Amino acid sequence: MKRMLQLAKDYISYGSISYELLRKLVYKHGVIKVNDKHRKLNNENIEDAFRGELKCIEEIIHNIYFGTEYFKVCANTLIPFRLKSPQGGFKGKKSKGFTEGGNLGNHYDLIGELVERML
Amino acid sequence: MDFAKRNYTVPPFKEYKLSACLTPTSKNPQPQIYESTIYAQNHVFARSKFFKLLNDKYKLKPSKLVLLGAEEIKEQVTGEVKNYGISFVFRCKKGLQNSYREFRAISRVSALDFLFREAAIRIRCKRNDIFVIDIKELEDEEIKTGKVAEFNQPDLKFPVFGKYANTRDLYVPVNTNLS
Amino acid sequence: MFIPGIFVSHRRALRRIRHTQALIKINNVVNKEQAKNYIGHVVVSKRLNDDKTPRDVEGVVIGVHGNKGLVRVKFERNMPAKSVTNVVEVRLVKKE
Amino acid sequence: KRVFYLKGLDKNLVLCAVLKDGNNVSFFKIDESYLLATSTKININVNEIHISEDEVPLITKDKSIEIMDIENSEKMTKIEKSIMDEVRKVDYLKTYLNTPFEIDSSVEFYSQKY
Amino acid sequence: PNPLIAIKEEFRKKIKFVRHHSDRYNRVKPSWRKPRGIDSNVRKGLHGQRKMPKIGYKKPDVVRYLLPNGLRKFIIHNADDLEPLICLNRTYCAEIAHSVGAKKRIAIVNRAKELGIHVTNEK
Amino acid sequence: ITFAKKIIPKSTVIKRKTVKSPNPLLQSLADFYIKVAKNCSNDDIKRIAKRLTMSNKDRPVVR
Amino acid sequence: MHKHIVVDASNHVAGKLASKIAKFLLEGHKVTVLCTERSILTGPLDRSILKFKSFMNKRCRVNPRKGPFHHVLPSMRFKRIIRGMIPYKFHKGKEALKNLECHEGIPSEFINSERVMFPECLLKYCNKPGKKYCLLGELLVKFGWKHSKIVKELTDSILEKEKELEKRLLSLK
RNA sequence: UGUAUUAUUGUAUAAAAUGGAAGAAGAUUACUACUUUUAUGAGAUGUUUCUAAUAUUUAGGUAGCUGUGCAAUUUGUUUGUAUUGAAGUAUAUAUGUGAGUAUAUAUAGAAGAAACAAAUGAGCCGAUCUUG
RNA sequence: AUUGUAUAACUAGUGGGCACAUGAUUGUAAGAAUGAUGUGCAAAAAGGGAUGAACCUUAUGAAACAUUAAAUAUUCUAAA
Ligand SMILES: [Mg+2]
Ligand SMILES: [Mg+2]
Ligand SMILES: [Mg+2]
Ligand SMILES: [Mg+2]
Ligand SMILES: [Mg+2]
Ligand SMILES: [Mg+2]
Ligand SMILES: [Mg+2]
Ligand SMILES: [Mg+2]
Ligand SMILES: [Mg+2]
Ligand SMILES: [Mg+2]
Ligand SMILES: [Mg+2]
Ligand SMILES: [Mg+2]
Ligand SMILES: [Mg+2]
Ligand SMILES: [Mg+2]
């Protein structure tokens, strides 16, 4: 997966967020799939998504953080998040790399500065 | 930043102490550790500068390296002005050159930024092109430039030519004194 | 109870005009920080009728615009754009 | 004109008392939003004043509405000695409520304390 | 009053869809036709030219075909033709065709009075 | 850990509610079996409701 | 709210003063300029002659009457500078130019009226100190201004000559 | 204090045909070199209302292919209008996203409309188009 | 990562192309001629390069409100 992000670096900025910000994403922007249709992510649609194995939203965030055997099924039932433009705008350019002066590329742990303004 | 219009006491560049080593393998577990100090704006910019330096002195590719720990160094400033001498290597159009300058500032973070202001006119290059070797505090009788030796002598007095207006208004009547 | 002002222009681009929002220069306001207090205040503009009687249209301040205290405002029927450099007034009544 | 705020009603209105030509007060109802507050205050208890909605008239925004003068209540004149005594205590208060309020030029409105 | 009249006035427009160049000559009638040329500036839809009809302008089905009184009109030919719309007294209104003579037009108004049907076309 | 999704066969899904033939009796047979096949669990009944809405070519003759 | 303003134009840069006035007209005020022969033009005198000599070369070749005109007077030269900032063709710019008036020196009507100055345009506070410059009316003598001597005498003489309470508090209360 | 190199930078070398182009006025703090903040600004991206085969997913389009609908003349069946005034024509008003439809007033004087099916000589701005 | 995949039947338009980035052959050279990989104009809206088929941001029904990108903040011209 790291080699795939190397080739697609002209459109992608990626990092590694903490636990508290990961908890903030799912409660605001969360859409579940059941029978190939998007739904509201309630406590009842979680039942029909996982056939009764998971009964709460907090069960999902525990499995993405500590990588368990339920990683692939929980990460796939979420559709991609849809975020806003950043409050305050981009600093340099959008085209150049991060170490060059722009925004694209690998932020290692400083991705938590960009996502919270877009959140 | 109350009186000035830019932060001259805490510039964007800081000081970071870095350390790294190679990832362990079967042929070579527990390899050698290294340490240095690079000046940058965050630890991510300082990670990229330090790993390129380790590419040249040794054949260590940065894809196999692992970052151990990076901490920042701050200095309890008193407020006395000191003398500093910086030696560095800059990259220009024709090739590389090495020079030497002497400055006067409060701390070595601040004395570095007085070099970037002088290099914007005499050298005309981006700030990432200068590589700083060392910053040291100079005692007396090592000052090789008359500019530092002229200001180091005690009891200085010189006036100021007044050319700035004291009102941020569009128009004032004639004979009001902008002192 | 009214503070005088000057209708400067509509909300502009270089080559496109948004006809719904208007910019007003209030008297003696020179900053962003002083302009943040004048929000929600009713603005009354005076324009004529067909039988030459007075007619009145009112509007509410929406927000600030720029670094020098210019203020956006939204009316009921928009300004006729030939009334550039005329005088409107600001009331001291807040409307929420 | 500066007007003593007596008591708020339930109709999103207030009760208010303005002075008149000689030692005379009245009652009227206007919105809460039509007002502006100052830091000066006298002490008038709320249980002395009694409220009746039909006695007191109201005033709208528009000027050209004729208002009717209702006959003065007997409870008012007992309250009138409880407020016209209060104007005599503070030095130059009758001259304060006669002078009309004016916005001053060359100074911003939201700077002063009022 | 009827609440449907205030809902009806929310969906109104001024746009008229007049054919291009219909003012320049008297050959071209102002009914709408679509341009199919090569260099046509109206076909590409640049700003400053006329607008074209699209399906996004369509009103909802509650408000469509509604008179300003709040009803939907219907055409009668007889004095006895009012029989199917007796029960729909509040929803529908009736009007008379333009071929009915003046003598037969009198007997329609007396029959619409007893049942309670509201007639628009008078005099 | 996976979950297998249920596969509805395409020979049981219905596409056309109206028959192309101008016969009023065939229309009255067709909507009757559609009304049953929605609330039925048996599979072969759903196959009949699709086969009534096909053409002349797709239901050939049987000896 | 629109004000009337008399401006002393002396000790000002020529181009920068005309920039601030053109926004002051487009909000609907009225303004008058006095002593326009004493504005400053930066640079040496030798370049400023070469710039004006190139302006005197442009004339229409077919019919020179219907061509670019070259005014000489320092009042009418200052009006040509302000016209470049304003959209003088449409109705919006035709109105703002009807509130502008400039003069030569100080006439008789304005001896008692006050004047103002602009602190963003004064030479001591705009530029770096110690460079060469020249005046405006000093330049236009060489191009054919017939009278620069009488205006100097009349203005300088103008610029030389200018260089029972406790009872009423108790009774009214 | 001066002679050698290196880096940055200024001037000369530098000549054309109607009156001229940093976009222009004009600028020496509106030019050039290097940093941090603030604001303006796109069917972009977010929030709410509505239309298209419970669209929280899809919607541009020349050549070209398919579906749902409006206008005209004649034929079979059913229903109805008209000398207190049919068809035509000229001005308004309402209604339809649109081809279009309905009504009102003036003029004129003898026949015309709607629904379920049928037959085509079935819808013009252009062709150095034809006739007046 | 994808809820479908696979298979048949019938039929239209087109066969004069040009430009940008990377790299080449002939030619003194060309807005010259001829090949290779990717994306465009042709057939593609709005905003910016004063103006321009191909340059830079950028996916598509009718509208209103807030946040940015490309580019700019003496004045024409919104913004120290
Ligand atoms: Mg930015
Ligand atoms: Mg690119
Ligand atoms: Mg903004
Ligand atoms: Mg969009
Ligand atoms: Mg948008
Ligand atoms: Mg389409
Ligand atoms: Mg034919
Ligand atoms: Mg014709
Ligand atoms: Mg044609
Ligand atoms: Mg002819
Ligand atoms: Mg072609
Ligand atoms: Mg374009
Ligand atoms: Mg250009
Ligand atoms: Mg401006």
PDB file of N, CA and C in Angstrom, chain B residues 97-149:
ATOM      1  N   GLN B  97      30.497  28.043  -2.885  1.00  0.00           N
ATOM      2  CA  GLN B  97      31.483  28.892  -2.242  1.00  0.00           C
ATOM      3  C   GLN B  97      31.304  28.813  -0.738  1.00  0.00           C
ATOM      4  N   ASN B  98      32.344  29.218  -0.023  1.00  0.00           N
ATOM      5  CA  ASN B  98      32.350  29.238   1.431  1.00  0.00           C
ATOM      6  C   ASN B  98      32.868  30.582   1.912  1.00  0.00           C
ATOM      7  N   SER B  99      32.215  31.127   2.933  1.00  0.00           N
ATOM      8  CA  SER B  99      32.489  32.479   3.388  1.00  0.00           C
ATOM      9  C   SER B  99      32.466  32.523   4.907  1.00  0.00           C
ATOM     10  N   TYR B 100      32.431  33.740   5.440  1.00  0.00           N
ATOM     11  CA  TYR B 100      32.490  33.981   6.872  1.00  0.00           C
ATOM     12  C   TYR B 100      31.935  35.363   7.171  1.00  0.00           C
ATOM     13  N   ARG B 101      31.062  35.450   8.173  1.00  0.00           N
ATOM     14  CA  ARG B 101      30.459  36.720   8.550  1.00  0.00           C
ATOM     15  C   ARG B 101      30.488  36.867  10.064  1.00  0.00           C
ATOM     16  N   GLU B 102      30.359  38.109  10.522  1.00  0.00           N
ATOM     17  CA  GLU B 102      30.308  38.427  11.943  1.00  0.00           C
ATOM     18  C   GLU B 102      29.114  39.327  12.201  1.00  0.00           C
ATOM     19  N   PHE B 103      28.336  39.005  13.226  1.00  0.00           N
ATOM     20  CA  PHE B 103      27.108  39.733  13.494  1.00  0.00           C
ATOM     21  C   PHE B 103      27.041  40.112  14.958  1.00  0.00           C
ATOM     22  N   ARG B 104      25.897  40.663  15.340  1.00  0.00           N
ATOM     23  CA  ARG B 104      25.654  41.121  16.695  1.00  0.00           C
ATOM     24  C   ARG B 104      24.169  40.980  16.994  1.00  0.00           C
ATOM     25  N   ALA B 105      23.824  40.103  17.933  1.00  0.00           N
ATOM     26  CA  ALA B 105      22.421  39.868  18.238  1.00  0.00           C
ATOM     27  C   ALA B 105      22.279  39.367  19.664  1.00  0.00           C
ATOM     28  N   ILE B 106      21.050  38.974  20.005  1.00  0.00           N
ATOM     29  CA  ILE B 106      20.750  38.547  21.367  1.00  0.00           C
ATOM     30  C   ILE B 106      21.000  37.051  21.539  1.00  0.00           C
ATOM     31  N   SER B 107      20.535  36.232  20.601  1.00  0.00           N
ATOM     32  CA  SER B 107      20.720  34.792  20.686  1.00  0.00           C
ATOM     33  C   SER B 107      20.997  34.249  19.296  1.00  0.00           C
ATOM     34  N   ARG B 108      21.479  33.002  19.242  1.00  0.00           N
ATOM     35  CA  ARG B 108      21.979  32.466  17.979  1.00  0.00           C
ATOM     36  C   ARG B 108      20.846  32.125  17.024  1.00  0.00           C
ATOM     37  N   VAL B 109      19.628  31.982  17.540  1.00  0.00           N
ATOM     38  CA  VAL B 109      18.475  31.880  16.655  1.00  0.00           C
ATOM     39  C   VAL B 109      18.223  33.217  15.977  1.00  0.00           C
ATOM     40  N   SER B 110      18.406  34.311  16.716  1.00  0.00           N
ATOM     41  CA  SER B 110      18.176  35.635  16.154  1.00  0.00           C
ATOM     42  C   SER B 110      19.324  36.063  15.257  1.00  0.00           C
ATOM     43  N   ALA B 111      20.547  35.628  15.569  1.00  0.00           N
ATOM     44  CA  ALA B 111      21.704  36.037  14.777  1.00  0.00           C
ATOM     45  C   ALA B 111      21.733  35.334  13.430  1.00  0.00           C
ATOM     46  N   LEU B 112      21.044  34.200  13.319  1.00  0.00           N
ATOM     47  CA  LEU B 112      20.938  33.525  12.033  1.00  0.00           C
ATOM     48  C   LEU B 112      20.058  34.313  11.081  1.00  0.00           C
ATOM     49  N   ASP B 113      19.012  34.948  11.604  1.00  0.00           N
ATOM     50  CA  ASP B 113      18.067  35.635  10.736  1.00  0.00           C
ATOM     51  C   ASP B 113      18.633  36.953  10.233  1.00  0.00           C
ATOM     52  N   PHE B 114      19.648  37.487  10.912  1.00  0.00           N
ATOM     53  CA  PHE B 114      20.319  38.667  10.384  1.00  0.00           C
ATOM     54  C   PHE B 114      21.224  38.300   9.219  1.00  0.00           C
ATOM     55  N   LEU B 115      21.590  37.023   9.111  1.00  0.00           N
ATOM     56  CA  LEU B 115      22.343  36.574   7.948  1.00  0.00           C
ATOM     57  C   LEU B 115      21.440  36.446   6.734  1.00  0.00           C
ATOM     58  N   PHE B 116      20.193  36.018   6.938  1.00  0.00           N
ATOM     59  CA  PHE B 116      19.276  35.856   5.815  1.00  0.00           C
ATOM     60  C   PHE B 116      18.882  37.204   5.230  1.00  0.00           C
ATOM     61  N   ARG B 117      18.850  38.243   6.064  1.00  0.00           N
ATOM     62  CA  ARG B 117      18.535  39.572   5.562  1.00  0.00           C
ATOM     63  C   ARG B 117      19.686  40.143   4.750  1.00  0.00           C
ATOM     64  N   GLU B 118      20.925  39.893   5.176  1.00  0.00           N
ATOM     65  CA  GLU B 118      22.063  40.377   4.403  1.00  0.00           C
ATOM     66  C   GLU B 118      22.246  39.563   3.128  1.00  0.00           C
ATOM     67  N   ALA B 119      21.901  38.274   3.167  1.00  0.00           N
ATOM     68  CA  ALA B 119      22.104  37.424   2.001  1.00  0.00           C
ATOM     69  C   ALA B 119      21.054  37.679   0.932  1.00  0.00           C
ATOM     70  N   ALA B 120      19.989  38.401   1.278  1.00  0.00           N
ATOM     71  CA  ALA B 120      18.944  38.693   0.304  1.00  0.00           C
ATOM     72  C   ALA B 120      19.393  39.757  -0.688  1.00  0.00           C
ATOM     73  N   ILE B 121      20.453  40.493  -0.359  1.00  0.00           N
ATOM     74  CA  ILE B 121      20.919  41.551  -1.247  1.00  0.00           C
ATOM     75  C   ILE B 121      22.245  41.167  -1.891  1.00  0.00           C
ATOM     76  N   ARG B 122      23.211  40.740  -1.079  1.00  0.00           N
ATOM     77  CA  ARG B 122      24.559  40.490  -1.580  1.00  0.00           C
ATOM     78  C   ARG B 122      24.629  39.207  -2.399  1.00  0.00           C
ATOM     79  N   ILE B 123      23.837  38.202  -2.038  1.00  0.00           N
ATOM     80  CA  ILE B 123      23.917  36.900  -2.684  1.00  0.00           C
ATOM     81  C   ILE B 123      22.713  36.588  -3.562  1.00  0.00           C
ATOM     82  N   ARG B 124      21.500  36.979  -3.155  1.00  0.00           N
ATOM     83  CA  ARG B 124      20.253  36.792  -3.910  1.00  0.00           C
ATOM     84  C   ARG B 124      19.969  35.318  -4.188  1.00  0.00           C
ATOM     85  N   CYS B 125      19.692  34.574  -3.124  1.00  0.00           N
ATOM     86  CA  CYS B 125      19.359  33.160  -3.215  1.00  0.00           C
ATOM     87  C   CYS B 125      18.284  32.801  -2.195  1.00  0.00           C
ATOM     88  N   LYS B 126      17.582  31.700  -2.452  1.00  0.00           N
ATOM     89  CA  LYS B 126      16.565  31.193  -1.545  1.00  0.00           C
ATOM     90  C   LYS B 126      17.195  30.724  -0.240  1.00  0.00           C
ATOM     91  N   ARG B 127      16.380  30.717   0.820  1.00  0.00           N
ATOM     92  CA  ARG B 127      16.893  30.492   2.168  1.00  0.00           C
ATOM     93  C   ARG B 127      17.291  29.041   2.391  1.00  0.00           C
ATOM     94  N   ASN B 128      16.844  28.139   1.518  1.00  0.00           N
ATOM     95  CA  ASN B 128      17.160  26.726   1.683  1.00  0.00           C
ATOM     96  C   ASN B 128      18.502  26.380   1.056  1.00  0.00           C
ATOM     97  N   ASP B 129      19.173  27.366   0.461  1.00  0.00           N
ATOM     98  CA  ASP B 129      20.396  27.079  -0.279  1.00  0.00           C
ATOM     99  C   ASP B 129      21.634  27.276   0.583  1.00  0.00           C
ATOM    100  N   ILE B 130      21.501  27.988   1.699  1.00  0.00           N
ATOM    101  CA  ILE B 130      22.629  28.177   2.601  1.00  0.00           C
ATOM    102  C   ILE B 130      22.699  27.015   3.579  1.00  0.00           C
ATOM    103  N   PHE B 131      23.886  26.434   3.725  1.00  0.00           N
ATOM    104  CA  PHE B 131      24.134  25.387   4.706  1.00  0.00           C
ATOM    105  C   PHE B 131      25.050  25.941   5.781  1.00  0.00           C
ATOM    106  N   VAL B 132      24.575  25.955   7.019  1.00  0.00           N
ATOM    107  CA  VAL B 132      25.277  26.589   8.128  1.00  0.00           C
ATOM    108  C   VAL B 132      26.163  25.544   8.785  1.00  0.00           C
ATOM    109  N   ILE B 133      27.448  25.860   8.952  1.00  0.00           N
ATOM    110  CA  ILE B 133      28.357  24.921   9.601  1.00  0.00           C
ATOM    111  C   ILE B 133      28.270  25.046  11.116  1.00  0.00           C
ATOM    112  N   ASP B 134      28.574  26.226  11.651  1.00  0.00           N
ATOM    113  CA  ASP B 134      28.574  26.393  13.096  1.00  0.00           C
ATOM    114  C   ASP B 134      28.277  27.840  13.454  1.00  0.00           C
ATOM    115  N   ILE B 135      27.673  28.018  14.626  1.00  0.00           N
ATOM    116  CA  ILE B 135      27.497  29.324  15.243  1.00  0.00           C
ATOM    117  C   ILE B 135      28.205  29.293  16.585  1.00  0.00           C
ATOM    118  N   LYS B 136      29.049  30.286  16.834  1.00  0.00           N
ATOM    119  CA  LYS B 136      29.799  30.352  18.075  1.00  0.00           C
ATOM    120  C   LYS B 136      29.717  31.763  18.627  1.00  0.00           C
ATOM    121  N   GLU B 137      29.805  31.872  19.947  1.00  0.00           N
ATOM    122  CA  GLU B 137      29.898  33.176  20.574  1.00  0.00           C
ATOM    123  C   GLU B 137      31.352  33.612  20.650  1.00  0.00           C
ATOM    124  N   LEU B 138      31.615  34.815  20.156  1.00  0.00           N
ATOM    125  CA  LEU B 138      32.964  35.347  20.054  1.00  0.00           C
ATOM    126  C   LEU B 138      33.275  36.177  21.286  1.00  0.00           C
ATOM    127  N   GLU B 139      34.430  35.931  21.893  1.00  0.00           N
ATOM    128  CA  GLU B 139      34.905  36.846  22.913  1.00  0.00           C
ATOM    129  C   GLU B 139      35.612  38.029  22.270  1.00  0.00           C
ATOM    130  N   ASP B 140      36.220  38.852  23.112  1.00  0.00           N
ATOM    131  CA  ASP B 140      36.966  39.992  22.614  1.00  0.00           C
ATOM    132  C   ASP B 140      38.276  39.533  21.987  1.00  0.00           C
ATOM    133  N   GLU B 141      38.884  40.435  21.214  1.00  0.00           N
ATOM    134  CA  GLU B 141      40.171  40.285  20.529  1.00  0.00           C
ATOM    135  C   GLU B 141      40.171  39.145  19.519  1.00  0.00           C
ATOM    136  N   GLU B 142      39.000  38.720  19.050  1.00  0.00           N
ATOM    137  CA  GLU B 142      38.861  37.823  17.912  1.00  0.00           C
ATOM    138  C   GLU B 142      38.039  38.466  16.811  1.00  0.00           C
ATOM    139  N   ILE B 143      37.598  39.698  17.025  1.00  0.00           N
ATOM    140  CA  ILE B 143      36.746  40.412  16.088  1.00  0.00           C
ATOM    141  C   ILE B 143      37.598  40.881  14.919  1.00  0.00           C
ATOM    142  N   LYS B 144      37.294  40.376  13.729  1.00  0.00           N
ATOM    143  CA  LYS B 144      38.085  40.653  12.543  1.00  0.00           C
ATOM    144  C   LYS B 144      37.452  41.694  11.636  1.00  0.00           C
ATOM    145  N   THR B 145      36.368  42.328  12.060  1.00  0.00           N
ATOM    146  CA  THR B 145      35.659  43.286  11.227  1.00  0.00           C
ATOM    147  C   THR B 145      35.474  44.577  12.007  1.00  0.00           C
ATOM    148  N   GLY B 146      35.699  45.708  11.338  1.00  0.00           N
ATOM    149  CA  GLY B 146      35.635  46.987  12.026  1.00  0.00           C
ATOM    150  C   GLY B 146      34.223  47.407  12.382  1.00  0.00           C
ATOM    151  N   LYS B 147      33.225  46.802  11.735  1.00  0.00           N
ATOM    152  CA  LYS B 147      31.838  47.161  12.008  1.00  0.00           C
ATOM    153  C   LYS B 147      31.414  46.711  13.399  1.00  0.00           C
ATOM    154  N   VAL B 148      31.827  45.514  13.803  1.00  0.00           N
ATOM    155  CA  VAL B 148      31.535  45.051  15.150  1.00  0.00           C
ATOM    156  C   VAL B 148      32.411  45.784  16.158  1.00  0.00           C
ATOM    157  N   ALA B 149      33.643  46.111  15.760  1.00  0.00           N
ATOM    158  CA  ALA B 149      34.576  46.773  16.667  1.00  0.00           C
ATOM    159  C   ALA B 149      34.209  48.235  16.881  1.00  0.00           C
TER     160      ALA B 149
END
